């Protein structure tokens, strides 16, 4: 946060500092070739169609001519394996912003990190609608908003509570 804001003193608030991308653990090639790995963020090469994503079992009903499925934005969201004729959804790998929630450096050096739009199982762990929050303890009490997190969630210093 100090490097991003170009200052040695950071005021109280939330600051967008980085971007979290789930790195491809393996590379998969399927030609009419390597093994098929599902439920992981991997690189894939289906019949010369390259990409990076998570392969999941699909409930789509591809007709026989149809091979790879495109969404509204013409990105490949479903693909048929050329060896075993089954359909797989391609969810994009987990990416999000990394924001650092901190009070003033005059007050404390403790920080918490928010992974925006990232579930907590792909990264004091608390799951919010805004994302996964690490380093802040969740309390059942309600206070006024000090540092805004989002989706009704706010953070404060008293340790850092959410």
């Amino acid at each position: 946060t100090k490097c991003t804001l170009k200052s040695f003193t950071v005021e109280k608030g939330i600051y967008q500092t980085s971007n979290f991308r789930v790195q491809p653990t393996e590379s998969i090639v399927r030609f009419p070739s390597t093994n098929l790995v599902k439920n992981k963020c991997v690189n894939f090469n289906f019949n010369g169609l390259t990409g990076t994503g998570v392969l999941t079992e699909s409930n789509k009903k591809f007709l026989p001519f149809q091979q790879f499925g495109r969404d509204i934005a013409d990105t490949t969201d479903a693909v048929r394996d050329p060896q075993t004729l089954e359909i797989l959804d391609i969810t994009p790998c987990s990416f999000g912003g990394v924001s650092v929630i901190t009070p003033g450096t005059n007050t404390s050096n403790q920080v918490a990190v928010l992974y925006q739009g990232v579930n907590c199982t792909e990264v004091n762990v608390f799951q919010t609608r805004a994302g996964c929050l690490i380093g802040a303890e969740h309390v059942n009490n309600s206070y006024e908003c000090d540092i805004p997190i989002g989706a009704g969630i706010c953070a404060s210093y008293q340790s850092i509570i959410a």
């Binding site: 789509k60 591809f62 007709l63 001519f65 149809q66 091979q67 499925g69 495109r70």
Partner: protein, 254 residues
Amino acid sequence: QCVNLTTRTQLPPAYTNSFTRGVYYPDKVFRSSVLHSTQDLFLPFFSNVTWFHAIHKRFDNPVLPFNDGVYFASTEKSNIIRGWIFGTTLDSKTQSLLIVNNATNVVIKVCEFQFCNDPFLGVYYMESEFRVYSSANNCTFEYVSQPFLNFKNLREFVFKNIDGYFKIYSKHTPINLVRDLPQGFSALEPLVDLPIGINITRFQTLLALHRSGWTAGAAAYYVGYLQPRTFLLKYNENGTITDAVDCALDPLSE
């Protein structure tokens, strides 16, 4: 072996309306609940489609241009239409494409056939007559496949030749209309892509005679020509094209 057919009755070919037929899937991509705009070689809606008959004495096998692509519709009963001929000069000078569907299988051959003036198949009242070409010297591509096929059956095909690739699109429709093309919508599934790599400017329809001279079975086919244009296709929740809009037909569809 070639045989001239000299018992034909002279009649001009007819014309009719295309309605909303001739739409094919532009690619092999699944799309669901979407409206997709594509610019491709399509058959215009409500266009003037040429009508040819086979009735007894009509036997319509003329020489037609291919142009950018050909939509071929068939109101067929009792299996008279058997295949197509593609080429430029239709002789041994150039290389030509043969598509036939005999009693057993579908055969596609790319050879320099010395074609007959009246190529035909025959049914004796069993198939024991085949007079399409007199020779085949240089053959580059062979492909043997499954059988593709009141008028009871509607056969739609789209033939395109881009970048040396011959795209054949097909759709089979159960119909009960007596004389003309039914009015409705049916998206043509892609049937085969052949890497033939040959020049095609002219094509021929292959028919089958009935022998008991010769008699022509009751059949009718329609030839339309593709033009480069834009369509708006509607994909439902099941990935099937259910409706289409011609972008250049009228201001409402535009």
